[PDB]
Amino acid sequence: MFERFTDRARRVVVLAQEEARMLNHNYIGTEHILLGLIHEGEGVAAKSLESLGISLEGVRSQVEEIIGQGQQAPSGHIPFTPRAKKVLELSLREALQLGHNYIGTEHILLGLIREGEGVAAQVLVKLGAELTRVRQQVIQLLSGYKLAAALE
């Protein structure tokens, strides 16, 4: 499905699989996409969360506290959960609502919040990372970057 994904956004979903592997989970949940997103660290999604005053280390610690560590590291491909698949479906819907013709890390963060049930949504809203607030923060951050770039 990942044809519309930017290099950074594909980097997030590859990192989600490796986050599951290292915690000994044989699934990729909303929790592993959120960890892949903060692991990437550089994209509009990580910057959007930091610009709301949220600690990325603090996000990792909150997620890891909830999900714990499985018993046996799995082998090869790790299957997405249906709600993780829903995050990725909603990332596309959020890109269309912003009039973007790409799926960036910022659309994955919106997808994670909009899924509204998982470990990712629970941690994020608890930190004040609500959907309409983050949509506006992503638009404003993109606008702010394009104005700064315009200086060089």
Author numbering: 1 to 152
Copy text verbatim from the article accompanying this structure deposition.
ClpC1 is an ATP-dependent homohexamer that is responsible for substrate recognition and unfolding. ClpC1 is a 95 kDa caseinolytic AAA+ protein with an N-terminal domain (NTD) and two nucleotide-binding domains (D1 and D2). The essential ClpC1–ClpP1–ClpP2 proteasome complex of Mtb has recently become the focus of several drug-discovery campaigns. The NTD (amino acids 1–145) has been studied extensively to determine the most critical residues for the binding of ClpC1 to several natural cyclopeptides with potent anti-TB activity.
Excluding the four N-terminal residues, the r.m.s.d.s between these two apo structures and that with bound ECU (chain W) are 0.43 and 0.68 Å, respectively, explaining the importance of these structures in solving the large asymmetric unit of the ClpC1-NTD–ECU complex. In addition, the N-terminus of ClpC1-NTD maintains a distinct 310-helical structure in the RUF-I and CYMA complexes, rigidified by the covalent bond with Met1, while the N-terminus is more extended in the apo structures and in the ECU complex. In addition, helices 4–5 and 8–9 were shifted by about 3–4 Å owing to a pivot point in the 70s loop. It was observed that one conformation is captured in the apo form and the RUF-I and CYMA complexes, with a second conformation being captured when ECU was bound, in solution or in the ECU-resistant double mutant ClpC1-NTD-L92S/L96P. Apart from the protein termini, the 70s loop is the most flexible portion of the NTD structures. The region consistently has higher B factors and was more challenging to refine, with unusual orientations of residues. This may reflect the true nature of the protein itself; the mobility of this loop may allow the domain movements that are observed between structures.
